[PDB]
Design a binder for this molecule. Structure first.
Ligand SMILES: CNC(=O)c1ccc2[nH]c(C)c(C)c2c1
Length: 160
């Protein structure tokens, strides 16, 4: 069903995360963590205190797809992570813990009807790493992903 998913997304905030390689998204999926540059780290920490759920929607650059979405379970904090960088390791910030809500892909062709008011109404696939996605656009984007039957949102609801 979709009822628990809709509950988790209620009054949520949404951020587009752009990764330059698949390896970092796979590590995030395996370990339940993300790290970003300080300008985005500060924004995500502010958002985490501001909203019931903060949702990161991941896209690997040049893939033409989103790779899934996840909810922040903590602010950033400073084991290490063997990220693959394009940079010099210590240019990144702290580590955010995340709970995956969907690990399945969604092609950009399926989100062509979604525009983001916070990025000049460009298609939601367009945005810098860290671009906030307005509530209605972000909710509809998350609802487009294929259902991920491996995930149980019961534990995620209790963290709200
Ligand atoms: C120009 N931005 C970057 O190179 C960049 C930004 C955010 C990032 N998060 C992680 C895990 C990496 C490797 C990374 C690189």
């Amino acid at each position: 069903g979709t009822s628990k998913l809709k509950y988790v997304l209620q009054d949520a905030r949404f951020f587009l995360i752009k990764s330059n390689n698949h390896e970092n998204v796979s590590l995030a999926k395996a370990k339940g963590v993300w790290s970003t540059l300080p300008v985005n780290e500060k924004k995500l920490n502010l958002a985490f205190r501001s909203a019931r759920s903060v949702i990161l929607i991941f896209s690997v650059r040049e893939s033409g797809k989103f790779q899934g979405f996840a909810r922040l379970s903590s602010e950033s904090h400073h084991s290490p992570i063997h990220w693959v960088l394009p940079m010099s390791a210590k240019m990144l910030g702290g580590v955010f813990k995340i709970d995956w809500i969907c690990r399945r892909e969604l092609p950009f062709t399926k989100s062509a009807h979604l525009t983001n008011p916070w990025n000049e109404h460009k298609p939601v696939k367009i945005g810098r790493d860290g671009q906030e996605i307005e509530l209605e656009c972000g909710t509809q984007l998350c609802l487009l992903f294929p259902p991920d039957e491996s995930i149980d949102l019961y534990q995620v609801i209790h963290k709200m």
